Amino acid sequence: SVWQTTDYIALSMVVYRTAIKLRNFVNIRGLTPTEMIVIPWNVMRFYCEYNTGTYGLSGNVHHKNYSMLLACKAHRPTKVGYTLSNLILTSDELTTTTFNTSPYMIHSIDDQQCLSKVYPKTDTVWPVSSMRELDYVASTVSGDNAIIPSTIFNKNRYWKQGDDALHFSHDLDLGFWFGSDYGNAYVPQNNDSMNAVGTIPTSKHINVRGVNNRGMAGHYLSFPPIRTNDGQFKLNAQFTLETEIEFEFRLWEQGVQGINSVHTNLNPANDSLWIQSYGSLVSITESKINNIQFGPTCPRVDARNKGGKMSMLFDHH
Amino acid sequence: SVWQTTDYIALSMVVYRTAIKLRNFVNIRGLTPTEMIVIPWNVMRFYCEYNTGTYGLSGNVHHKNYSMLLACKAHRPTKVGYTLSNLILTSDELTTTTFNTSPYMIHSIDDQQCLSKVYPKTDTVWPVSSMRELDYVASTVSGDNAIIPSTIFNKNRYWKQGDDALHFSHDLDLGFWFGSDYGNAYVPQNNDSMNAVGTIPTSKHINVRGVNNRGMAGHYLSFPPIRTNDGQFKLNAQFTLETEIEFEFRLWEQGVQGINSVHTNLNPANDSLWIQSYGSLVSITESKINNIQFGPTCPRVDARNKGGKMSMLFDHH
Amino acid sequence: AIKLRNFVNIRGLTPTEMIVIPWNVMRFYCEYNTGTYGLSGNVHHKNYSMLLACKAHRPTK
Amino acid sequence: SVWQTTDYIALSMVVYRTAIKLRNFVNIRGLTPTEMIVIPWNVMRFYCEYNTGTYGLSGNVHHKNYSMLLACKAHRPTKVGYTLSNLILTSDELTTTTFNTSPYMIHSIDDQQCLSKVYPKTDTVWPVSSMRELDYVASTVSGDNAIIPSTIFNKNRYWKQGDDALHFSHDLDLGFWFGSDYGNAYVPQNNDSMNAVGTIPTSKHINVRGVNNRGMAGHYLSFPPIRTNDGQFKLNAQFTLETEIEFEFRLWEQGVQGINSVHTNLNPANDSLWIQSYGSLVSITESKINNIQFGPTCPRVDARNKGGKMSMLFDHH
Amino acid sequence: NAVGTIPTSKHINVRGVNNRGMAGHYLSFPPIRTNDGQFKLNAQFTLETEIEFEFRLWEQGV
Amino acid sequence: VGYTLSNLILTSDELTTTTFNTSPYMIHSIDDQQCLSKVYPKTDTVWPVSSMRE
After folding, report:
1. Is the CB of A314 less than 8 angstroms away from the CB of B210?
2. Which of A227, B240, D245, F2 could disulfide-link to B85, CB 3.0 to 4.6 Å?
3. Chain E within 8 Å of F42 (Cβ-Cβ)?
4. In chain B, what residues touch D8 (CB-CB under 8 Å)?
5. Do chain C and chain D touch with ≥3 beta carbon pairs under 8 Å?
């Protein structure tokens, strides 16, 4: 038996799991039956950054568990999800607003991807600081036609006062980690719109390449068209938004390799094999979201092209 | 039953296995505790070409089984390995050198890849003809810090006189073969540094592409720092180097296709599907190695991104 | 954990004097003070600089 | 336990097996019932070298597996065989040639060795480049008598359109190997005509000596005599010639002994014990075969003098 | 390669994989010599081809 | 995808008038080793795409 030193790999490979859970009240008002609320639930900033009211305008809204994930060697988003809860419906009438139980708010999931990319209304804009209170309104309009959102979208839940909460989750299986901040990136997705790895593959070695089409369908809030004598009912909704994003993180190398002064020199170069930049960004100019891309996991994609391990390790020339 | 001719595929697919086993004495001298011996065990030339003493300077040092593999249609490196055996430790004192049992020589495997790329010492150079007697010395130095190699490297065996031999093997599972000489190439590896296939993928058909990160960690020889009144003990080591590389080779097409005169014309064009040039070369100017890249199989890479079949067959546009 | 490995050379120690193992000091385990390192700069392990980004940390074993 | 180095014998003794399979169409025309086609199936050049049409005239017709066997340390012919298949019989009438099913082509094996040595017809010659398309015609003639070949030869198969293919194999058990090219040699045979080892035994040591009478009988193609009003039917035949020769080969010495530069010096001298030159040559002047010797394994030779191991290791003084 | 669409950047594309191809099929006649030249051999046969398609319909709804 | 060759009728042209003969055969060759990677028409011959099935 030849004597050998302790293992430094075991502790560098141990995966730690954390989450960021944030809760919010949402007031949806002034939404006509043609326009819909766009749930930016495919954006990393939605889950781990609290943009509501004065917060998003004020200062650093990042959760402290995330600012810590940036002190880790690597972090990975894994599961992500949100819950719509405790719906309160109101009508504006003519103007004073009161409660009514009979209506419903329509939660729409766009699985067939009727809407590939979604823009704000003409005079409307989408502040990134307003993200969590769900104010992003899109008016779906054909050439002369005004689409009713609930009619095109595959999954439409009519959600009523007293109904149970609406839970929506998305699992991420990434073969790779992230070493930097998300920075108004979508949650990692392999789509027609976007890919999960952000690092440009460089030649003469293996790189991380996205694989298999894991994406999130567009989630949309809408109200049923109900006609008054003149025009439509103005239906309003309050509910509770609870989001959760579950991170995996991983620590620094054991030994002298992980010493602050010499880690700059001794940092592994093959971190590029498992450590990646965030893949695709939401389109942002100033603080305002230009459009939101969705790109669900397509049900008509071959089932063999859908499944685990969103990335593979693939050479480049 | 329609009559049909004999099968010519069976004999073209039969895989034959050979090895090249070479044995060598190694004398490591003048190695301070800061500098380390770099085992060029990731280089094809290390196993199948005998570079020692006058041989490497003299003439053709290739083993004859390899010169035959070049008469095959295809050959593939498969397993590769070396054995360090029968360690003899000596000290230089002041100058006359004598035997001492108590010290040890440190064999270091760099799994975490503290050292991505390794250069010779400033005045030192790395002759490619000196490869098998392990004289390649690297001085690991931080900005003001002189690294002790054993302290950063993950696996460090302290190997003593009388200890059993040190065996190190690397299996290669290649989905492809090679039709040419290695030519100062690393053994096929999928790394941050290097990829196993050398053929540039060309458009409008499938090409061989490296996959899954199979690489070899840096192997390093070092001595423990032991202080004299002035300076360090000068520790020297002899041992036996037995290397083995196990080749698979494959023969020519049966039938008229494999006739010398018409095989030039009738050589299959889809050889490009299973026949490849060697992927990545050691950096050589003149006869001297500029640097040695290692790129281990990374333990923090996803286990699903590590495993068999170092290549896949993938289209190009 | 923070695992650090080091070579130690004890020299010039008479039988009356002894080497004091500072193994009761936190700085001994999680900070690498050897050779030029301790003189050079920040010798703290990076897992510790992260523990300071945690809400709480505790030394245990 | 005394430590010892790895074994270099095991890999030098491993025997690898290959074959050369070649397929050919044969057109036998203008063969009278007195003359016969001589199947040069006892010639090495018949199996491993493709002499047909323009090939034999053009250039290098050797199969590439054979050019590789010459890069081996040793190679050995072992089994050899050919298949006659898919017979098509035609008649020339008066001149235009048409198909007829009723005749047959006679395949004759000369076991009793009626014909020891076989010469071409007076104006006919036997190009070595014409070997595989079976055009070598011999006219068997006694003093005043014209022999009908089928009548003297022991085994005569009357082979008809629609009959199954004619398979003929010959196994070789050689106690020795070959290090050079066959070079218009017969396949190794111990005969009245020929012996399998080509190396002249040299004095004061053991040499390889042929033993036991393994030989191949003369194979002959002929047509039955069928009389017209004036003369004979002119019967013609097409069939498919598939030949196969199965080689065993063996690789170079492991270790420094098998290094290109020093193998010239360190080549074993006792290769002369198992490595031999080819025994007996077909008689060739220019490109033309002078005669073909057959020398079957004689059925009236003692059965104890027939059997395995065509050679023994025998001293010389 | 089987896919004709040029892969475009910043998303996933369909890429061909695994080498499925069809060998060359060839019709030929055996060489059979006349007095001068070869037999001219001719052939009639019946060619029945079949290609089996899968198809898929349009999206339901509006 | 697939095709079937069926009911072979072999004839010879002789000298010119063409007649039936059973004894020959037509060779169907599948090139698995890909002796021929790419195949061109004969020099004076061309390959009309409208002639494909015969």
Report:
1. yes
2. B240
3. no
4. 21
5. no
